[PDB]
Design a protein around this ligand. Structure first.
Ligand SMILES: Cc1ccc(CO[C@@H]2C[C@@H](C(=O)N[C@@H](CCCCN)[C@H](O)c3nc4ccccc4o3)N(C(=O)[C@@H](CCc3ccccc3)NC(=O)OCc3ccccc3)C2)cc1
Length: 246
């Protein structure tokens, strides 16, 4: 996260870190006692399932926390349209090896209904342990960063991505995506934030509106972060979680 600040412990208790062979590769969001939502592209076919871990309840990746729990994965389920076509569906359900017990530091985020709309301009918050500027890592002890970002409609977002774009660069924000950020850049999600939550405030609660998916260089002007919309997958998520491990 570029242009944000460090979250206090417990602030975003659904944020998880997904590591592969012990190295943080992506964020995710706890959504039930045994399921995490993250981005499909975080889970290349080459990678071995048993080498992944999910760390929950920790705000600093390098610091021991008595409130932290770390889990392996029983299953990784990318949405089929990601595997089949690869133009969208950048979302995956991760089933933890064992169900977790919630605490003050580990709580699920509510998912939006299929037709939930989150208005352009809503100030949501993206969180993660990704780069804090293009080509600049978050330093040890790796405190979770948070950043307030207004929602930007996919239509505005496409127009912005088209400014000074190369005609042949895939910069299309699909129907299952939304953007968030600033036209002027400087504040955005960056590499390593992939898969983590865009949390939006609604009726006194927080909902998982988006999953950090892609963008151009972090914080570039005219290139706000792009997120997979959780609403677009609500029926599928609810079906999978309920069928497999309710
Ligand atoms: C539907 C769909 C299909 C395929 C994808 C996968 O796109 C990959 C993962 C994503 C990615 O990097 N997201 C990170 C979160 C970004 C937050 C928004 N900022 C995430 O944390 C992460 N994921 C990583 C994977 C490997 C290594 C490091 C990774 O870090 N990319 C990108 O962001 C590409 C976008 C190109 C693109 C456009 C349309 C479509 C598919 C790809 N942007 C980029 O490389 O930056 C441009 C540049 C110019 C110059 C210098 C540096 C960077 C590529 C996603 C969605």
């Amino acid at each position: 996260i570029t242009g944000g600040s460090s979250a206090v412990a417990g602030q975003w208790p659904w944020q998880v870190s997904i590591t592969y062979e012990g190295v943080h590769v992506c964020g995710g969001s706890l959504v039930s006692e045994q399921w995490v939502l993250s981005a499909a592209h975080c889970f290349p076919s080459e990678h071995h399932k048993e080498a992944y871990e999910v760390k929950l309840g920790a705000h600093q990746l390098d610091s021991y926390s008595e409130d932290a729990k770390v889990s392996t994965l029983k299953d990784i389920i990318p949405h089929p349209s990601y595997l089949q076509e690869g133009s969208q569906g950048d979302i995956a359900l991760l089933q933890l090896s064992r169900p977790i017990t919630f605490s003050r530091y580990i709580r699920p985020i509510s998912l939006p209904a299929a037709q939930a709309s989150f208005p352009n301009g809503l100030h949501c918050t993206v969180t993660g342990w990704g780069h804090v500027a293009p080509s600049v890592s978050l330093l040890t002890p790796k405190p979770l960063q948070q950043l307030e970002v207004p929602l930007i409609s996919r239509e505005t977002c496409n127009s912005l991505y088209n400014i000074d774009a190369k005609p042949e660069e895939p910069h299309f924000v699909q129907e299952d995506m939304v953007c968030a950020g600033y036209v002027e850049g400087g504040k955005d999600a960056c590499q390593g934030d992939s898969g983590g939550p865009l949390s939006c405030p609604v009726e006194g609660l927080w909902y998982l509106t988006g999953i950090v998916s892609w963008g151009d260089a972090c914080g570039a002007r005219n290139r706000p972060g792009v997120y997979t919309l959780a609403s677009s997958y609500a029926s599928w998520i609810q079906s999978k979680v309920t069928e497999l491990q309710p």
